[PDB]
Design a protein around this ligand. Structure first.
Ligand SMILES: O[C@@H]1[C@H](O)[C@H](Cc2ccccc2)NC[C@H]1O
Ligand SMILES: O[C@@H]1[C@H](O)[C@H](Cc2ccccc2)NC[C@H]1O
Ligand SMILES: O[C@@H]1[C@H](O)[C@H](Cc2ccccc2)NC[C@H]1O
Ligand SMILES: O[C@@H]1[C@H](O)[C@H](Cc2ccccc2)NC[C@H]1O
Lengths: 442, 442, 442, 442
């Protein structure tokens, strides 16, 4: 039994399943998905926060942007929907007409994901389950359906872990003023006792109805409610020990940390479990303005996951569905392409551990990432070298045998000084897809 | 940007407008205005608090007095309205039948007021705006009108600053026992988390709907809610920097202090901005039992404002309207009379600063008050001397020229020892009204 | 960098070296070592606490015991040393005349310990290093030597890790009344701010002077100083990230938990790192009353270690030296015994991880424990079976091969139903020492 | 009387004398003044903090620097003084052989300073008065003199106000590890209750012995002592109401805020009193490596002061004396320069208030600043224009007359559109020194 205190909850470490899953699908879907619109300005960590909230590239932030008059979103809204059309009104057009959960889970399984996390309530405070705590949810409005639940059955049928995203820190149903600058976030929050009780009841509800594998909170937890978390975590873990919890509660406990786009990205191995999060494009919620110029390429996705994994993390890729319940093809294409590379190279990703170091580079700088599996050292090149002679800078293998991962073919190598040279026959190099993968056994 | 912490809110000082306004109208109007009744016992600071709540001379306290059986109010109520008539029932007779806000603002402008503050919710918890937090408000009951709002438009059209009074500390809708002695106030309060949230939401609502120039709280703020105030003040000031806030919250911040009847009245210059408050009569809410024997005279009003002003304060005079929305003539007379003296002598009051000292007295003790305006020193006599030779005790003017304020007429004066003698020709003395005003230029 | 807050320190998990060490030596050595006397009552968890402190079997508790008049220790003292003989007088008799730190480290290395932790200050508050915060230390009294530092140099040259034990929660130099019942521990403590600073300054000083590998606190941390630990842990981890901290501070953070004698002993796999501690006998400090009847036997030491290791823990075995600095022969014998067994079987102990289950037993009740090392599963019998037929209950191996560990000889086995039967040829059975160890590869 | 609580202390606003003084002298003088060495890296706000403490340009940080092995300061020390030479050894070389406090005060008076504030104790914890709480002070070591008191007597006889600087947040006598990165400041501090008492007792003692006009704390106040400040401020203000306090205590109360070099510098009118501080050069303590290339020029000092004053602030210019007590010539020259300009233009600086705006510029980009004194508006050009035609952008004066300040000569001007043009006859332009100053009366 876990007890309701930080010292006792320290005992709960991140579950083996999570540590091994390596790749998950985040899903930001809500009434904001309907206008599904945002100025695709850039990447968090790259856009000056002085203008960010006024040129918000995150479509889930539509209501906050709409509250800022004379903001691209405001202009777009009045021209498209009209001045008199309140944000909340989108819960009526959000009908998920063409939603098939089994199709999503199927697609996430094909894409190589091992877990899925949908936004159950994002900052606009609209809920995608039949909460008994508010009438602004998907059962009484829009869809008339318990999306969280039906999706949880599907992802589970597909044999995938299911977690929940929940906006503990922000709920615009409790405020009127929009966020215009980062500092605003320190005072424009629900602030009441009532809201702290609401968050607590709602996450308890998610724990009772769905017993998720992950509690992924966002934007901190209401100060007046931080202490409830001792009770909620004990309760949760006691019902579900292999459950997990992220680091965005603003309290002493968490099972794994998080890093967003540029924000918090580790340069080398950190000493704890973490998860990198990002959209395929610049937004989490669907943005009709994003085209391929904005999205990552399959090649880029793979390089990303491999880098995140060689560093001890998991990659939580976000997809942003449309109001009708369909997943844009630009995003479906890319999921399938990552999926495909994972079918071929899964074994060097899933279930792996960090090695002595994460990184290395060749003589002409192709970047190299490492992962472990007991005595087997996977060597992953972000790309496929042209030459057959290959020179890895600063590295000596103690191992006796290096093998070409996809074929098995033993390879010739020798510690040439402070480096290691290996010879890969073009017939092999020609077989790899996106990444030349070697396998060393010391 | 102001931040949600006491140290950062320290930066907000009392707005220039307030410091210069000098005189404001407080308005205590509510369902208590209908019985409009109280035993006119005396002045706060003069009535022994051992009997005060049982002989309450403040008519807005009607419900508290009514809850004390065998109390003059209780007797009067059962004879006039009946045992079976609950206090709350007055919200049905409170119909403001004859209310014209434009007429009030007009009258307050003529009376010389620069700002106005109506009680939006007094201790009986009835609200004079359409709050969404309670059904006991003027839109759903009584008037069927948003009094706060309609009055805010009017006072603003009249070009006057508008603030709000709000009973943060007491709300009898959350208690059943009456206050019988001062000590009772330490435990008979709403006390719940819910009430702290209610106050916070309601003042936020007043800030959102009306963005007042002044947040005038009363009776302290619910202990469980004091910390919200960091957030509310930052929020408020950030929306309205020239906004102001009084000192009755029981937290580290405030823009100006307060003093009631005898309670907290400074003897000389204090080193911060404050505001003296009092009714024209002994009550704030309308009291049909008060006659002129109870009210201040125009002469007394003027002497009061001048004394309060020479000491750095503002005078917040309270008027108590009737249930029909009309302002008793006894009170209208006096407002107009103060107004009249302000038309003549405004320039020695509005926009002034304290001088080296506030006070002085003549040889035969007519009291004298001082105000400044750069190098111009206004010298105000509380009354008009008969003689022409005048002797001001303990004072030497360094200034070269003294002038009779109303005419301009240079006057003859000399430092005669530790005193100053001046000669005012009766033709001049005969021109002043209520106060002989001199003007010195050093 | 770690930051001074529980959330950030959570980032620091137990160092890999500690997780893999499995076996460490504790050393209770102090002026109490001189009288080196205690009644061998029994084991913590088995002696009713109503009598425990009056028949204290822990000899380091001599001063507490002496403070209880008419207690075995009091009588013993009066008779052997006299009434005029204060406990602190032992600091001068504690001369460590025959102490050779390098012999100790040689000794601890032979026995198999991978780390050593001496008491730098026990409840009697005597310090075994030249602290600058007290004169009651080994540099100024007795030994005229920095025991801690001199021992650190030696252990480190033997290639073993060094940690320190510090009695943060109790210090008899700051109290007068002895502990008679467990409940006394709740109010009889130093209690002052001055004591909290002292404790703070002393651990800071140990960090600064010897940068220990483990900070082993005991009896909790002074309530007034609990918040100092955020700073101290951050200070310590930023200077020594591979450093570690136990769980006896009473704050949200720890790297490994502790169990003592019967107290807090897990029956199956917990999910965090812990360490078990006990003496070779019933006391931690030297007890000249203890005979082999009170000590564990090499066989019991071995079974203790295996049991602890199969459950994720480390065993911290305590050694109680004499005031002259020699390690009593009954204890030296036993270390050597354990050390010999480790020489033969250590590869199935050091560097291992837990398996799916920790335990199993033979049809005839010999106890079995498991440990893992990748694909290799070590099956350690707590003793050596007689028959060649071996039936382990409730167990089926999927593994293709099962080898007899010490020789490597493949063995025959088959999953006979819900059990597993293996045949161990007497020649092999006769080869093992104390424990029959098998190796299975899946 | 002030009461010991933030709400009541709010009553104390910044004293009129301080608001009107505008210019003050800071004096960093200590044993660090002896080595008087530092690498002139640059200005705070412009040197990346990742390197800052290893190339510290603030010479008073010598001990911190010395504590970092292989740091310019460490090398410099070892080479010049030796390894066996501890920093505290400088207390004995700090003999102030040529110190004449009255020459200093004469000097500060000529330069224009209206108040002086010497460091009574800097981060190295050496005290420049005969404190009774430490032996590390100027009465017992070095100077054998009460520097603080002797300097207070002199400054006060010169008719200037006296304040004290006290390093409440840092004291290296209580720590061992140096600050290497800004984040260290969060855990490397005295941290003990004993230190909080000490700090408390030492400021109490400065109040008691010299009743300073300003209490200038630095680096925040020990967390354990924050609540002591309610008592101390109340104690101080009740003994000296015209006393004042800066904003580096980290509690709800302060009389004026502070900005340092680039750090916290306002671009336009804030709405509270603040003070700007910087050295004549890059360091506060004497740096014998600094040459004119590192110092501001009299012209830059003047523009600095005008800019600060037009924005509501005071400039606290720092002077760094030598261990013998003489003020280096490059700095004396500059004070005198500033002092001469103040002799001519001071009436447009001392006693002024801010105007509606602080700034404006000429069509040709010469910067302009404004200051007020009732109806008089001073227009200070940061330099002297060449043409006689002067076009100030975005500005219209309602004022009837515009005079050339130093002479009084009426000038011609007209609001040519959105600008204002004035003609300054070269004879006048040639009369001004460093800044063309005009005077406008409305
Ligand atoms: O859209 C949400 C937001 O991007 C947060 C991160 C964030 C950080 C700073 C400003 C806005 C948003 N990550 C989770 C997303 O669901
Ligand atoms: O009627 C209210 C009450 O007089 C408070 C002052 C007060 C003080 C002590 C007892 C009762 C009331 N001032 C504001 C008025 O609206
Ligand atoms: O003597 C110390 C005591 O055993 C603590 C545990 C303890 C618990 C309860 C009573 C006495 C002791 N563990 C370490 C030993 O050094
Ligand atoms: O050396 C002191 C330091 O400049 C503080 C400000 C400061 C801030 C950050 C690092 C070092 C110093 N201001 C007063 C000076 O005496």
């Amino acid at each position: 039994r876990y007890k309701p205190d930080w010292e006792s909850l320290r005992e709960h470490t991140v579950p083996k399943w999570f540590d091994k899953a390596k790749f998950g699908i985040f899903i930001h879907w809500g009434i904001y998905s309907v206008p599904g619109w945002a100025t695709p300005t850039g990447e968090l960590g790259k856009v000056p926060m002085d203008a960010w909230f006024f040129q918000n590239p995150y479509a889930e932030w539509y209501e906050n942007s709409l509250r800022i008059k004379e903001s691209p979103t405001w202009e777009y809204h009045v021209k498209t929907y009209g001045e008199n059309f309140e944000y909340e009104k989108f819960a009526d057009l959000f009908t998920a007409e063409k939603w098939d959960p089994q199709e999503w889970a199927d697609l996430f399984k094909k894409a190589g994901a091992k877990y899925v996390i949908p936004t159950t309530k994002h900052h606009d405070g609209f809920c995608l389950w039949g909460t008994k705590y508010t009438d602004f949810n998907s059962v009484k409005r829009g869809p008339k359906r318990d999306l969280v639940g039906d999706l949880a059955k599907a992802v589970r049928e597909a044999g995938l872990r299911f977690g929940v995203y929940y906006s503990g820190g922000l709920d615009w149903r409790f405020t009127t003023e929009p966020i215009r600058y980062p500092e605003d976030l320190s005072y424009i929050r629900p602030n009441t006792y009532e809201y702290a009780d609401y968050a607590y009841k709602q996450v308890m509800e998610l724990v009772d109805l769905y017993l998720p594998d992950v509690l992924w909170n966002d934007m901190g937890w209401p100060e007046k409610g931080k202490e409830d978390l001792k009770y909620l975590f004990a309760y949760y873990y006691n019902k579900h020990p292999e459950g997990s919890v992220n680091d965005r509660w603003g309290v002493p406990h968490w099972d794994f940390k998080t890093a967003e786009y540029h924000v918090n990205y580790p340069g080398d191995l950190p000493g704890y479990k973490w998860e990198f999060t990002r959209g395929i494009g610049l937004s989490f919620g669907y943005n009709r303005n994003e085209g391929p110029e904005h999205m990552l390429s399959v090649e880029q996705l793979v390089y990303t996951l491999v880098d995140v994994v060689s560093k001890g993390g998991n990659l939580l890729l976000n997809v942003g569905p449309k109001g009708d319940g369909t997943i844009p093809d630009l995003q479906k294409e890319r999921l399938l392409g990552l999926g495909e590379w994972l079918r071929k190279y899964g074994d060097a990703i899933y279930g792996t551990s960090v090695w002595e170091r994460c990184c290395a580079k060749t003589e002409d700088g192709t970047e190299i990432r490492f992962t472990r599996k007991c005595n087997r050292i996977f060597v992953i090149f972000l790309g496929i070298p042209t030459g057959e002679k290959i020179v890895i800078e600063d590295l000596n293998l103690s191992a006796g045998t290096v093998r070409h991962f996809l074929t098995g073919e033993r390879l010739s190598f020798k510690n040439v000084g402070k480096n290691l040279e290996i010879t890969v026959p073009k017939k092999l190099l020609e077989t790899d897809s996106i990444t030349l993968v070697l396998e060393a056994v010391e």
